[PDB]
Design a protein around this ligand. Structure first.
Ligand SMILES: [Mg+2]
Ligand SMILES: [Mg+2]
Ligand SMILES: [Mg+2]
Ligand SMILES: [Mg+2]
Ligand SMILES: [Mg+2]
Ligand SMILES: [Mg+2]
Ligand SMILES: [Mg+2]
Ligand SMILES: [Mg+2]
Ligand SMILES: [Mg+2]
Ligand SMILES: [Mg+2]
Ligand SMILES: [Mg+2]
Ligand SMILES: [Mg+2]
Ligand SMILES: [Mg+2]
Ligand SMILES: [Mg+2]
Ligand SMILES: [Mg+2]
Ligand SMILES: [Mg+2]
Ligand SMILES: [Mg+2]
Ligand SMILES: [Mg+2]
Ligand SMILES: [Mg+2]
Ligand SMILES: [Mg+2]
Ligand SMILES: [Mg+2]
Ligand SMILES: [Mg+2]
Ligand SMILES: [Mg+2]
Ligand SMILES: [Mg+2]
Ligand SMILES: [Mg+2]
Ligand SMILES: [Mg+2]
Ligand SMILES: [Mg+2]
Ligand SMILES: [Mg+2]
Ligand SMILES: [Mg+2]
Ligand SMILES: [Mg+2]
Ligand SMILES: [Mg+2]
Ligand SMILES: [Mg+2]
Ligand SMILES: [Mg+2]
Ligand SMILES: [Mg+2]
Ligand SMILES: [Zn+2]
Lengths: 134, 122, 52, 86, 50
RNA sequence: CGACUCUUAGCGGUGGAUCACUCGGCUCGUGCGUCGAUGAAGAACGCAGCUAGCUGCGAGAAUUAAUGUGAAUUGCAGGACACAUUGAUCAUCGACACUUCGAACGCACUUGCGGCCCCGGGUUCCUCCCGGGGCUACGCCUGUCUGAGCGUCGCU
RNA sequence: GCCUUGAAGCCUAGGGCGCGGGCCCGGGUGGAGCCGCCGCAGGUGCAGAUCUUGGUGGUAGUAGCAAAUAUUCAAACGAGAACUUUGAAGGCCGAAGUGGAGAAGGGUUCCAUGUGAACAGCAGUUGAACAUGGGUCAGUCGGUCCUGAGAGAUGGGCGAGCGCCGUUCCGAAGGGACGGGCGAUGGCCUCCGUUGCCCUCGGCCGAUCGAAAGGGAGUCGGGUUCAGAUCCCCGAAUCCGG
RNA sequence: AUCUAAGGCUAAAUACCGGCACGAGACCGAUAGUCAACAAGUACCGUAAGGGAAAGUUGAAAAGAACUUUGAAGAGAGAG
RNA sequence: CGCGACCUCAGAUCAGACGUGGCGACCCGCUGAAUUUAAGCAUAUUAGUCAGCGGAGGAGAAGAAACUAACCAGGAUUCCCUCAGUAACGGCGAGUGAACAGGGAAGAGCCCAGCGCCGAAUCCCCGCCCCGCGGCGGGGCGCGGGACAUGUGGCGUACGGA
């Protein structure tokens, strides 16, 4: 249950903030989980997604274990574009198909300076969380 | 192609003005191309050049202002573009020293008869 | 006005000028017709500007 | 003769655009607006029309100076400084 | 009226530019509802405020 | 057998009711309680590669710098961005800049007329012409400067 | 408790109940929520109110498309011609015109190319419609200047007060200038203006506004555009100021 | 019996249909509720003061009907 | 026949400050009605109310008795409950209409002038040195200007007191 009186718990206000958020927030909302292996090694559960991450699809028509990469992150509509998932149009031209990132599993990352930094803060937060709860 | 203010802070008046001119020249040229028919590549630069100019002109006025206020510092009278800028009302108040002035009679009373710390039932 | 205009072209395109005439279009944009001294040719100068 | 034909002599304008108000009321012979009272310093504003007030108020156009005053109060009208460099 | 003034001439000019049709690339954006202008004006009908 | 008129049902039309949804209102309460001559409120005109409106902004004009974040914006284009020179886009907001009217302030509302000092062509002040910059409102307070009076006296 | 193995709502020559208010089943459509019991509460049940808002009928393929003498033959473009265009013939306006130019007002309606949805109360290959582009050039043409009937600030007066009266009326009302003297002034301080005075003459008599037909110096001919000319080009002049 | 005018200053307990931020509801649910759920004090009427609207919903995703054929085209039969 | 003065009085693009206008829900001061009720109407009521003109703050105003009372007496102002639909007003008709005392929220008191003493013992502006500078202050030296005796500062205001 909730106890704090300075935030909302109201249907209309959640939706309004969601459908009118700026981009530096849509990044977090457009987060996606990891696989079991990566969780174990890094001791983390979720990262925001990027443009050369390797991913699977879990739910829908295009689920299966075929693995692909990310191509384009159309935040304005809360979707992403994978390389092989695509359909033919009337003319005989292939085009991509958007899918929400909650429905995908990341298998390989795209690391760099900032993204290593980000993982470490998540690790230490959970670490003291376990050691102090326990 | 790139212009960064971080590079330009240390340079001088005249070099910046020379660099300023080359930009405006390039701007007049591109507008000619725009009208006679031009090309996509040369139209997607008109935005770039406009912003580059604003950088330069911005740097000039920042350092220019910041030598003047250093010059007038420590003086009774100074221009109005350098005085503090708040509400009119806040400019028609008392100076934080004129607030804490008291007559001798008020002072003397406070010395002899102040509030003393106490308690009861004990 | 006409004096400003005259000096500007002399300072830009490195040229000399007899006279000018002005009007204001219905779009609100002002326009000039500038005649050069006979020493100078306009087809010449127009290509330096890069215009035909 | 007081109808259709008397509406053919209309070629002589009475009102014209104000210089403070934007609207079209500046009486030429008499030199007053009729919605702003221009040549007077004080604005025509009567309290027997709520609607007539709420079309021109402090909250109607741009507010290109108050908009920042509200942003500056929220921190204490600070000035003369910068955040930490990098 | 052939003896205009400068204020009048700016005023008309804006209204003239402000009476053109709509671009077609606007019809394809995400959250577009706009089908046509419906703020246009035709000299022989719907005179001006002036 | 025919047309035509009437009744009922099935199907197709016209027109937009009911039903289900909702980035809107109304009502109550909590906290704070801030405009401007250092030029407000409001008005006008303008600014996008492709742009009319709404929105945002002011000739540095769909935004500059500076911090926080950390790989996009997107209807089409074209290019940039190397994210271990560092730094795309977003948000914030402490520096800089902020057209014409308007209490509106050189005199007047046609954008018409001027006056003073300074720089640069006008030559090398010497005066006419051009550009450019700074001043040029009403009332009022303290003090300075020059002044008026068969006002009250003193003095030679 | 019911439910994507199908909720609400809607239709129904179907089966049935209750004196009635009303309800339960069956079939079709449709696509996401809904009901029964005990208590609570209310913006709670329509045939009307020359009711309010929206929509649809008979009337009715009706009344009508009649003020101002008038059309015809052929050819061309074109899917396509009573109405466009070219030619020819017959006719009207009849110089106080159905002609050629302008003020007030309108404001891109102007000019070319293309189109034939809509509009042009029939039609249209046309359009003052729709779309895309282009177009207004001045020392001498007008404004700007002057004042007119008149409007309107200052001083003054009055008024609870925003303010009102009034325009020479209860005002130290012009910074107006000038010949002379005085020291200075930068230019070769010659000649000057000058910031400064001592002198020196000073009336005016009321700020300001007010007419694109009143008053107000001076430009004419020829040629040139899809569209502009006393403005552009050619050629001959002239006013003002220094 | 009770006060000492014709001079002056002062916080707290109180008010708040405009403003800046926040939360909540036995409320209305597109002819209702703000006139204004949408480019609304907009379009538009008026010489001016002023008056002042109508207008919500494709679908999970445009995958928004390629190609054939009749017709001047609009509209159609097929296919998807 | 120039200077000191004020009866006094004007001027300056003189040096340095200031005021004007806008919003206006709550606040302060003036001005100020008619529908309507009375089953008619003229006093009354509607109403010190709408409209109107001014002036502000984050609250404003009021405010530390020229009081209430008649008690074995309380003791600034402001809000709440109650006193009270009362005492009183009134074509005594329709209609209007408070205060004290009691119980609570909160709670804080103080300056001048005039009498009277102190070598005006007092204030502003320019100049120079040093700290501090973005709510322009402090300390020191100028036979540097000025306001003030037609009255500046210290002691002291009825709590009765000094
Ligand atoms: Mg004292
Ligand atoms: Mg001209
Ligand atoms: Mg008409
Ligand atoms: Mg519907
Ligand atoms: Mg659904
Ligand atoms: Mg209800
Ligand atoms: Mg009812
Ligand atoms: Mg009915
Ligand atoms: Mg009935
Ligand atoms: Mg007939
Ligand atoms: Mg006829
Ligand atoms: Mg003609
Ligand atoms: Mg004619
Ligand atoms: Mg005309
Ligand atoms: Mg027709
Ligand atoms: Mg035509
Ligand atoms: Mg005049
Ligand atoms: Mg004339
Ligand atoms: Mg008192
Ligand atoms: Mg007080
Ligand atoms: Mg609706
Ligand atoms: Mg509905
Ligand atoms: Mg509505
Ligand atoms: Mg005021
Ligand atoms: Mg009566
Ligand atoms: Mg009656
Ligand atoms: Mg009566
Ligand atoms: Mg009364
Ligand atoms: Mg009132
Ligand atoms: Mg007070
Ligand atoms: Mg009782
Ligand atoms: Mg009463
Ligand atoms: Mg009491
Ligand atoms: Mg208590
Ligand atoms: Zn006006």
């Amino acid at each position: 249950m909730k106890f704090n009186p300075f935030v909302t718990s109201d249907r209309s206000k959640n939706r309004k903030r969601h459908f009118n958020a700026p981009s530096h927030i849509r990044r977090k909302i457009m987060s996606s989980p990891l696989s079991k292996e990566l969780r174990q090694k890094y001791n983390v559960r979720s990262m925001p997604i990027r443009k050369d991450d390797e991913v699977q699809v879990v739910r829908g028509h295009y689920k299966g274990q075929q693995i692909g990469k990310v191509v384009q992150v159309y935040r304005k509509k809360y979707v992403i574009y994978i390389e092989r998932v695509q359909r033919e149009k009337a003319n005989g031209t292939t085009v991509h198909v958007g899918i929400h990132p909650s429905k995908v599993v990341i298998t390989r990352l795209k690391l760099d300076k900032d993204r290593k930094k980000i993982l470490e803060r998540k690790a230490k937060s959970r670490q003291v969380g376990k050691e102090k709860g326990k | 192609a790139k212009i960064k203010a971080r590079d330009l802070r240390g340079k001088k008046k005249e070099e910046l003005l020379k660099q300023l001119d080359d930009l405006k020249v390039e701007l007049s040229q591109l507008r000619v191309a725009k009208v006679t028919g031009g090309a996509a590549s040369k139209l997607s630069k008109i935005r770039v050049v406009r912003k580059s100019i604003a950088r330069v002109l911005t740097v000039i006025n920042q350092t220019q202002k910041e030598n003047l206020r250093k010059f007038y510092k420590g003086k009774k009278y100074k221009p109005l573009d350098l005085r503090p800028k708040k509400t009119r009302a806040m400019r028609r108040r008392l100076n934080k020293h004129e607030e804490s002035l008291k007559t001798k009679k008020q002072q003397r009373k406070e010395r002899l008869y102040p509030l003393r710390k106490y308690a009861v039932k004990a | 006005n006409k004096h400003q205009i005259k000096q500007a072209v002399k300072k830009l395109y490195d040229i000399d000028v007899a006279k000018v005439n002005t009007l204001i279009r219905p779009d609100g944009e002002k326009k000039a017709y500038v005649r050069l001294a006979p020493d100078y040719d306009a087809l010449d100068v127009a290509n330096k500007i890069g215009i035909i | 003769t007081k109808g259709t034909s008397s509406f053919g002599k209309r070629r002589n304008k009475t009102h014209t655009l104000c210089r403070r108000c934007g609207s079209k009321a500046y009486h030429l012979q008499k030199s007053t607006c009729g919605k702003c009272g221009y040549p007077a310093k004080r604005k025509r504003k009567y309290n027997w029309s709520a609607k007539a007030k709420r079309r021109n108020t402090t909250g109607t156009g741009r507010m290109r100076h108050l908009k920042i005053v509200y942003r500056r109060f929220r921190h204490g009208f600070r000035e003369g400084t910068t955040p930490k460099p990098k | 009226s052939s003896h205009k003034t400068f204020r009048i001439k700016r005023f008309l000019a804006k209204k003239q530019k402000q009476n053109r049709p709509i671009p077609q690339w606007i019809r394809m954006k995400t959250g577009n509802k706009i089908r046509y202008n419906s703020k246009r004006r035709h000299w022989r009908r719907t005179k001006l405020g002036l």
